[PDB]
A paper describes a structure:
The glucosyl moiety extends substantially out of the CD1b cleft and can exhibit mobility. TCR engagement caused two major conformational changes. Namely, the glucose headgroup was flattened by the CDR3α loop, being displaced by ∼5 Å towards the α2-helix of CD1b. This bulldozing of the headgroup was essential to enable favourable contacts between glucose and the GEM TCR, and also enabled TCR contacts with the CD1b molecule itself. To accommodate the altered position of GMM, the hinge region of the CD1b α2-helix was remoulded. Repositioning of Gln152 caused a ripple of conformational change, including the displacement of Tyr151, which caused re-orientation of Phe84 and Phe88 as well as shifting of Phe144. Collectively these changes altered a segment of the α2-helix of CD1b itself (residues 146–150), undergoing a rigid body shift of 1.5–2.0 Å. Thus a relatively rigid GEM TCR forced a series of large conformational changes in GMM and CD1b to enable high affinity engagement.
Numbering used by the authors:
A (entry chain A): 4 to 283
B (entry chain B): 3 to 99
């Protein structure tokens, strides 16, 4: 199957001072948002009709209650730790937790936490593991957290029992959107590049879904090794945009073409031809 | 410790004067999360701009997408204006088709 293979929840908790913290949260299938967290209500916003997967309304409400309690409890615990330790305000904590379906069918779960944009801890086989980047502060935090009754047990159930069944249910519920095929469009542009008599050609490819795509500058059947892929950028509405560049000598751009291959094209590759003397 | 935003301005479709399109501003690689982003038409803030909910990459850097419908012309100038703790003043990145 195509499209996303993982579900994760993220947390960003911003601590302004000892009495003021704010948390932002959301739920995602790979890079696609499916849940929002509404701080005004302490509940989740379901972005797609199928966002609850195969979960009952009661299970969805119990999970929202767990997150609501966690967000409140977490801010209180951090403010206490920050005071006991050498923590200067402001600071930000991030967390990510979820699971992914791999080839062969295994579902693997993960939980990572950061402080100041650096790794701080993770959960590896039901225990709190401090990250070396987190140093002594992470060792003390893990040792404190495991002392609170029920926490690690709740984490273990959510990660290893709840997440996998949720992921399967939501990948099936959302299949008509997650596994849809959207054709890209492509176009060429050019500009000067560093150095004498050098040109940079750009092949723009936009509007494709799912994310895997192949774009290469070519000379007939010869793939140009010099093709540089930019980072894949999002469009609104679950499609992507990519730039593939090639640096060439002036007077050597004629004969170049850009070829795009995508799952949506049914074997009909897009082929664009660069023309010289302003004939584009 | 703090990370300055990367700002990428691009249109959804190839630009054609008089044809409706979407203007995207992808702000990424920044830390901490607090940031102000505006899309501008001829130096003025566009009110009808939408944006993604906050997310972050594997290295913990935050990212956001801001977008709006726009109809490019020969004269009109579009840009993305960003303010963050790492920037002395708002940084303006012009859209160039
Ligand atoms: C939401 O969907 C989840 C996934 O459902 C499956 O996939 C989706 C996409 C659709 O195609 C569904 O039709 C399909 O069921 C549900 O979770 C899954 O539930 C099934 C059915 O209960 C369950 O199968 C059971 O598995 C155990 C063995 O499980 C262990 O071992 C496997 C490896 O072999 C491992 O992967 C597991 O993690 C466990 O360690 C097995 O003993 C069961 O056999 C018994 O029942 C069958 C009839 O079903 C019978 O033939 C046998 O003889 C025997 O009595 C049975 O095969 C899946 O394991 C489970 N998948 C996961 C990843 O958890 C989910 O169902 C709910 O949660 C389940 C854990 C279970 O409690 C169900 O009763 C619940 O309804 C569903 N709903 C929710 C709310 O999550
Ligand atoms: C439809 C979308 C849904 C998606 C579904 C997919 C599943 C998501 C999978 C991703 C997993 C998400 C993990 C989120 C973390 C949830 C933790 C629950 C804790 C509460 O539990 C917990 C809340 C109090 C918070 C105490 C501050 C410590 C916070 C630090 C925790 C670090 C995280 C652990 C890593 C080492 C509790 O102590 O609460 C009180 C508890 O509940 C009572 O009922 C019980 O009687 C008590 O004994 C317990 O103590
Ligand atoms: C239901 C729909 C889903 C939307 C709800 C949003 C969910 C928000 C909760 C996300 C939980 C993420 C789990 C990651 C835990 C983060 C661990 O935090 C740390 O690393 C603590 C850092 C401590 C620094 C020292 C003080
Ligand atoms: C903390 O910050 C908030 C919001 O900016 C402010 O209202 C509050 O009074 C400050 N409190 C402290 C601890 O000085
Ligand atoms: Cl995808
Ligand atoms: Cl030619
Ligand atoms: Na600056």
């Amino acid at each position: 199957f195509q499209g996303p293979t993982s579900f994760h929840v993220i947390q960003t908790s911003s601590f302004t001072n000892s009495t003021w913290a704010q948390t932002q949260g959301s739920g995602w299938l790979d890079d696609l948002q499916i849940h929002g967290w509404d701080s005004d209500s302490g509940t989740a916003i379901f972005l797609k009709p199928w966002s609850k997967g195969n979960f009952s309304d009661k299970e969805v409400a119990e999970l929202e209650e767990i997150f609501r309690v966690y967000i409140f409890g977490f801010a209180r615990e951090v403010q206490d730790f920050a005071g006991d330790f050498q923590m200067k305000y402001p600071f930000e904590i991030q967390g990510i937790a979820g699971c992914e379906l791999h080839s062969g069918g295994a579902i693997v779960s993960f939980l990572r936490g950061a402080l100041g944009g650096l790794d701080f801890l993770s959960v590896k086989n039901a225990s709190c593991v401090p990250s070396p980047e987190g140093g002594s502060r992470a060792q003390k935090f893990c040792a404190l957290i495991i002392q609170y009754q029920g926490i690690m047990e709740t984490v273990r159930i959510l990660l290893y029992e709840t997440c996998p069944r949720y992921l399967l249910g939501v990948l099936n519920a959302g299949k008509a959107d997650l596994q849809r095929q959207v054709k890209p469009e492509a176009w060429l542009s050019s500009g000067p590049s560093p150095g004498p008599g050098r040109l940079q050609l750009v092949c723009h490819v936009s509007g494709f879904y799912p994310k895997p795509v192949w774009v290469m500058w070519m000379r007939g059947e010869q793939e140009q090794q010099g093709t540089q892929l930019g980072d894949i950028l999002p469009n609104a509405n679950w499609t992507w945009y990519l730039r593939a560049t090639l640096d060439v000598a002036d007077g050597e751009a004629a004969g170049l073409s850009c070829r795009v291959k995508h799952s949506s094209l049914e074997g009909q590759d897009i082929i664009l031809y660069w023309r010289g003397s302003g004939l584009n | 410790i703090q990370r300055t935003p990367k700002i990428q301005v691009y249109s959804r479709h190839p630009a054609e004067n008089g044809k409706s399109n979407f203007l995207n501003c992808y702000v990424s690689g920044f830390h901490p999360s607090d940031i102000e982003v505006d899309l501008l038409k001829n130096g003025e803030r566009i009110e009808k701009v939408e944006h993604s909910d906050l997310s972050f990459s594997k290295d913990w850097s935050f990212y956001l997408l801001y977008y709006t419908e726009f109809t490019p012309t020969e004269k009109d100038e579009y840009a993305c204006r960003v303010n963050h703790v790492t920037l002395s003043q708002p940084k303006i990145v012009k859209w160039d088709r």
